[PDB]
Design a protein around this ligand. Structure first.
Ligand SMILES: *[C@@H]1O[C@H](CO)[C@@H](O[C@@H]2O[C@H](CO)[C@@H](O)[C@H](O)[C@H]2NC(C)=O)[C@H](O)[C@H]1NC(C)=O
Ligand SMILES: *[C@@H]1O[C@H](CO)[C@@H](O[C@@H]2O[C@H](CO)[C@@H](O)[C@H](O)[C@H]2NC(C)=O)[C@H](O)[C@H]1NC(C)=O
Ligand SMILES: *[C@@H]1O[C@H](CO)[C@@H](O[C@@H]2O[C@H](CO)[C@@H](O)[C@H](O)[C@H]2NC(C)=O)[C@H](O)[C@H]1NC(C)=O
Lengths: 51, 417, 407, 99, 51
């Protein structure tokens, strides 16, 4: 999955991960995919004008 | 064979001698493992008395393990003994009262640790009570002692799951340094159902005084009280606006003497798991002089290799606080007449309250909690089971109860969840 | 009426004890003599791990000192030795003032509640870095911290500084102390766009950090280094690099100034204090006591708001944590593999000394920290309309397959 | 009272309480307000009306207990000037004067 | 999937949130297939992928 912020096991606090966390993580500098744009994600990252 | 060296101390205002339980424990102690015991008692607790005495006994004889017993619930004491533990590296634990009472985060070097329980966990216990009857808690305030910052996060962690529909109204700190009033004026602003307390009984004493003036003592402002106050089971400040939940481990449920043998057994099993298993159990050696680093740290001491053990088959697996990871807890309510009536008891994951119905505080007021039953049909209401996987009811639904049928039976019966 | 109000202290040497008593005697003249009497008591800190504290309770608590001063042992040994006293007085609720404890280990006031010191911790050094970052306009940096209360606190402080701005958390890097092999992480670090670096660690660890960093050629121009006082000092310097910014606390080594200054400041806290009523003396005698001292938090409150900006050490004001405010640091440069003062920092504003700036590569000015990355690693998911996945036809990557419109 | 209402309306402070004393015209003040507040379509809220005066030596207790309940943002007060001094000292203690 | 946020935040849909959750898929290929296989009577997703 692209991924969503979720409880990190015992920690219960974690990054959205998947495509996005790799992005926060820096594995992928930029994400090109069919991604819907929403506020929950939006605070964490910049988003381009919706295509 | 091994002939270990151990010491135990009983300090008390309630009558028993260490000798009584000494010989008892050695008898009980006798078959399982070798042990050599020296017992000493001291009447009232002091930083100087305890430090001096423990160093006095330890140095004279090379004891490897001890326990601590008291008839007092003072808060500072634990930290002091813990401090001794950081330097000595000698295992210590305690079975009753203050030593059993929780303490601030343990240092990197292992310390004595039987008293603490994940305060978070403790709060989740309390939350279970809140889940049954508490929603939108009035206040959680980091007023005093350990975890003012720490308690603050968990509430957020609890709220963060967002599995149900949780929320907070009051979220502040403070007490003694200035006019109580900034905190008080802020507190006036909150308007909620259950007050959450994380302050010592001393602070609480004043807080009780604050609440009466504040109006928190009045109906609609339940108090959730931890061991921070609860600890003085014997003594309750009259001004303590009763009926608020005060709850911690109970002496009646578990004997104070009972705790010591088991621990000794655990020590024995630890040694069997360390000593027998290719490890050397070194003596304390140096405690009261110079700064020589105590001839360095013991190599392969292996004090914390086992944190989840059993004794007599009892699952006494321990937490990061060294505390029974199988919290044996009971729920206590401050009664109408200065009494901790047993509100309920906590077993494992499940939360238990002895009375399903919510007690009316004093006389019922303005027809509060009117008992209403709504028949269930396709047209008006509909009933389905609560999400037992979470142990909770659906957010947009209402948690419901009924009486499990027992017409013949004296009991009304419980058809909850 | 004058009642000698005892004071107590633990100091490095008897000479410093004499200095203490001298300052105290100076003290009676400055504050009103009739209202109160000042008397001085101190110890020369013989190195017993758990007995000096014994005597502190036996002598100083038995003497009911209204406050205690403490300094780092003259013998250059141990780390954060003054742990026990903060606990021991803790029952007493007796204010403690450290002269030399700039270490952040005792920052944990949840257990060090009774603890205090005039000097700012290593974490507070970040105040400089933000100001430094502010001037040069690099918003993009990297933070390298050891894993402990010290490093994590530094990170929290700097990030908190950044929180007022849009939070800037790119490339935080945590390593655990005592680790000799650390190169692998730096390979990860090259990847990141930002070219400015800041680090906090111990001297021993720092040797390993620079040792590993030099292997991957991290020090090269276009890279900047910002660091703590500890990093520039000790063994860190010898296998150590060039053109790296550094910090040294002003008057950190010399307690005596801090002794007279702290005492003058404390004097405001106690003398003003007695203007208030419902005061209680600190618990008299270690024995027979389990109760806190109700005045102590108040003494802390006035003492934190004590003012006394004029001082031997510099301006004095205390932040919420009890940590000192606006402490002055002296920026240091590595020119010709030697320490030099390029500038000095005092108050909220940096000051530029006449000395020429040095950077990695020798450029007079090296502001640009955004070289950037030519190639972008892009990520996707398998979604049928906007993405298609086919295996390479044998070795060949793709197919000449054509769209419905001929292309 | 009308002007007080107009002032409140201008700043659109809908929710208010009245603290009054046994001083003359207190009962009518309530009556005039009732009519003025009542006639209007708007759903503004009157939270509390308090009538208090010294009685014995528990006026402070009774007043304090009575005043402590209130939570409203906008307060209309009516009393003698001096009484206003005492009520304000009491409010400063209560924290009612604050922002 | 992002709609899960909608079900999450929409306490109004909690019922549906769980009802939905218990039947979720790792991907569209399986989610479309279930309806095609007739394993699941209905499938919920954003139109651009679905139409
Ligand atoms: C004021 O405090 C000083 C220092 O604590 C006291 O000087 C000590 O007096 C004791 C007498 O019991 C001697 O044993 C010490 O040698 C003295 N200096 C120390 C303790 O280093 C002085 O007595 C105190 N003044 C009064 C009036 O009690
Ligand atoms: C520290 O450990 C790292 C990781 O094992 C070493 O890096 C490896 O170096 C060898 C060459 O001796 C390469 O073959 C490996 O590919 C490297 N590891 C990785 C991640 O691939 C490193 O050599 C060690 N320290 C040094 C410099 O000796
Ligand atoms: C540490 O404090 C001592 C004593 O206050 C300082 O010694 C003084 O140095 C100044 C130099 O301007 C002399 O004028 C004084 O005579 C010295 N003794 C005093 C002030 O009584 C010392 O300078 C301080 N340490 C540093 C590095 O400044």
């Amino acid at each position: 999955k692209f991924g969503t912020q979720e409880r990190v096991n015992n920690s219960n606090a974690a990054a959205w991960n998947g495509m996005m966390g790799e992005l926060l993580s820096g594995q992928a500098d930029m994400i090109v995919a069919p991604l819907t744009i929403n506020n929950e994600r939006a605070q964490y990252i910049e988003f381009s004008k919706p295509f | 064979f091994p002939v270990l060296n151990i010491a135990v101390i009983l300090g008390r205002t309630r009558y028993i001698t260490e000798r009584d339980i000494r010989s008892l424990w050695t008898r009980d102690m006798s078959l399982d493992f070798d042990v050599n015991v020296v017992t000493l008692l001291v009447q009232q607790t002091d930083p100087k008395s305890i430090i001096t005495h423990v160093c006095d006994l330890m140095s004279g004889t090379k004891i490897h393990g001890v326990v601590f017993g008291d008839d007092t619930d003072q808060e500072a004491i634990a930290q002091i003994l813990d401090f001794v533990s950081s330097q000595t590296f000698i295992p210590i634990l305690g079975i009753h009262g203050g030593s059993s009472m929780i303490m601030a985060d343990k240092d990197e070097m292992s310390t004595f640790f039987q008293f603490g329980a994940s305060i978070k966990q403790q709060a989740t216990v309390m939350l279970n009570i809140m889940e049954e009857y508490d929603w939108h808690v009035f206040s959680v305030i980091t007023s005093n002692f350990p975890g003012y910052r720490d308690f603050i996060s968990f509430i957020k962690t609890t709220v963060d799951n967002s599995f149900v529909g949780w929320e907070v109204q009051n979220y502040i700190t403070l007490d003694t340094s200035y006019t109580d009033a900034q905190t008080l004026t802020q507190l006036k602003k909150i308007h909620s159902s259950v007050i959450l307390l994380y302050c010592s009984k001393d602070e609480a004493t004043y807080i009780f005084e604050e609440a009466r003036s504040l109006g928190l003592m009045g109906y609609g402002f339940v108090w959730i009280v931890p061991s921070l106050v609860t600890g003085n089971t014997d003594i309750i400040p009259y001004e303590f606006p009763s009926g608020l939940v005060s709850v911690s481990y109970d002496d009646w449920d578990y004997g104070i003497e009972a705790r010591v043998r088991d621990g000794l057994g655990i020590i024995t099993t630890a040694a069997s798991a360390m000593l027998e298993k290719h490890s050397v159990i070194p003596e304390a050696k140096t405690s009261c002089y110079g700064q020589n680093e105590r001839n360095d740290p013991p190599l392969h001491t292996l004090h914390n290799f086992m944190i989840n053990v059993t004794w007599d088959g009892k699952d006494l697996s321990f937490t990061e606080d060294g505390y029974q990871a199988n919290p044996k807890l009971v729920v206590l309510l401050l009664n109408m007449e200065r009494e901790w009536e047993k509100v309920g008891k906590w077993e494992a994951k499940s939360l238990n309250m002895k009375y399903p119905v919510w007690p009316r505080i004093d006389s019922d007021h303005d027809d509060n909690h009117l008992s209403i039953v709504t028949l269930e049909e396709a047209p008006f209401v509909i009933v389905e089971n609560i999400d037992y996987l979470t142990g909770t009811c659906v957010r947009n639904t209402v948690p419901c109860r009924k009486y499990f049928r027992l017409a013949n039976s004296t009991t009304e019966g419980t058809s909850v969840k | 009426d004058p009642k000698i109000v005892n004071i107590g202290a633990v100091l490095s040497t008897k000479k410093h004890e004499q200095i203490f008593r001298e300052a105290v005697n100076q003290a009676n003249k400055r504050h009103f003599t009739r209202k109160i009497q000042l008397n001085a008591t101190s110890v020369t800190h013989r190195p017993n791990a758990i007995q000096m504290a014994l005597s502190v309770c036996e002598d100083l608590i038995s003497s009911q000192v209204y406050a205690i001063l403490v300094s780092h042992p003259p013998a250059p040994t141990d780390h954060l030795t003054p742990t026990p006293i903060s606990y021991t007085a803790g029952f007493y609720r007796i204010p403690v003032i450290g002269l030399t404890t700039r270490m952040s280990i005792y920052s944990d006031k949840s257990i060090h509640l009774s603890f205090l010191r005039t000097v700012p911790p290593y974490s507070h050094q970040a105040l400089v870095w933000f100001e430094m970052m502010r001037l040069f306009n690099w918003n993009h940096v990297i933070l390298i911290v050891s894993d402990d209360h010290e490093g994590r606190a530094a990170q929290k402080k700097l990030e908190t500084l950044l929180e007022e701005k849009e939070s800037k958390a790119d490339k935080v890097l945590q390593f655990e102390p005592g680790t000799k092999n650390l190169t692998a992480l730096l390979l990860e670090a090259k990847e990141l766009e930002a070219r400015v670096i800041i680090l906090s660690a111990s001297e021993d660890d720092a040797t390993a950090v620079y040792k590993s960093a030099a292997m991957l050629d991290m020090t090269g121009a276009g890279y900047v280094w910002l660091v703590g006082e500890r990093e520039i000092s000790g063994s860190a310097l010898r296998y150590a690099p060039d053109g790296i910014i550094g910090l040294q606390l002003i008057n950190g080594k010399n307690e005596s100034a801090h002794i007279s200054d702290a005492v003058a400041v404390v004097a405001q806290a106690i003398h003003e204090l007695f203007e208030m009523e419902q005061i209680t003396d600190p618990p008299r005698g270690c024995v027979g006591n389990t109760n806190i001292w109700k005045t102590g938090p108040l003494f802390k409150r006035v003492l934190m708001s004590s003012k006394y900006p004029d001082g031997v050490t510099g301006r004095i004001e205390f932040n919420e944590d009890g940590d000192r405010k606006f402490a002055q640091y002296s920026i240091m440069n590595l020119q010709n593999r030697k320490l030099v003062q390029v500038g000095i920092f005092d108050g909220s504003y940096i000051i530029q000394n006449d000395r020429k700036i040095i950077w990695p590569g020798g450029e007079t000015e090296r502001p640009q920290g955004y070289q950037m990355s030519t190639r972008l690693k892009i990520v996707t998911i398998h979604q049928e309309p906007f993405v298609y996945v086919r295996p390479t036809t044998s070795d060949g990557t793709c197919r000449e397959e054509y769209t419905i419109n001929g292309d | 009272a009308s002007v007080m209402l107009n002032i409140m309306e201008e700043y659109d402070w809908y929710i208010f309480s009245i603290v009054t004393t046994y001083f003359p015209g207190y009962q009518d003040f309530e009556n005039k307000v009732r009519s003025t507040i009542e006639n209007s379509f708007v759903g503004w809220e009157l939270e509390e009306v308090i009538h208090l005066d010294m009685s014995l030596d528990d006026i402070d207790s009774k007043i304090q207990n009575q005043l402590k309940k209130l939570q409203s943002p906008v307060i209309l007060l009516y009393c003698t000037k001096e009484e206003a001094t005492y009520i304000f000292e009491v409010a400063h203690s209560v924290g009612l004067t604050g922002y | 999937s992002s709609v899960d946020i909608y079900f999450r935040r929409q306490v109004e849909l909690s019922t549906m949130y769980r009802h939905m959750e218990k039947h979720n898929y790792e991907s569209a290929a399986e989610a479309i297939q279930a309806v095609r296989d007739n394993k699941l009577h209905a499938f919920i997703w954003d139109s651009a992928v679905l139409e």
